[PDB]
Design a protein around this nucleic acid. Structure first.
Length: 87
DNA sequence: GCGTACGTGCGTTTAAGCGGTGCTAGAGCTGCCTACGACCAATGGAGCGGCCTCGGCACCGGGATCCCCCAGCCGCCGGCAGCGCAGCGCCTGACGGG
């Protein structure tokens, strides 16, 4: 097809074990059940901040596709530089 | 010390994941044309310097809160000690039995 898109409930795509594994890499031993909801918001809260300016780069370039070279650029402005994709 | 809820484990189950199409959109590049920003020479007046004088603020002194504190004070009530007592089991009568 050529219309519509998946635009619902995708915040639940981050399934409960996925965070549970992620936190294990952080070394936390025991986690209460309440914390799952906050990080999803927190993860989202951080996220569009990265996209919003990333989107801004593309429109100034008058593209339609989002390149990785733009993604790192905004990540530089926010502060967290990334090695391994460009430069 | 209490207790719940989150780790551990088991048993579905399902959507990720793989591998496979098929498409065209959009990025990349080229050709070519234009305009617009740098450059140059002049010009004057906006901005910056130098004085320089009042009053907004500083300072004071005084009077005005106003929270902060707390013993006063009582109410309350429960503990507590004393008192009156309710109920029971035994004590002990009433009266026939032993």
């Amino acid at each position: 097809k050529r219309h519509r898109k998946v635009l619902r409930d995708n915040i639940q795509g981050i399934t409960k074990p996925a965070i549970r594994r992620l936190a294990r890499r952080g070394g936390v031993k025991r986690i209460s059940g309440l914390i799952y909801e906050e990080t999803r918001g927190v993860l989202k809260v951080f996220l569009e901040n990265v996209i919003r300016d990333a989107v801004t780069y593309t429109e100034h370039a008058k593209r339609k596709t989002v390149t990785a070279m733009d993604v790192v650029y905004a990540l530089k402005r926010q502060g967290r530089t990334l090695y391994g994709f460009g430069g």
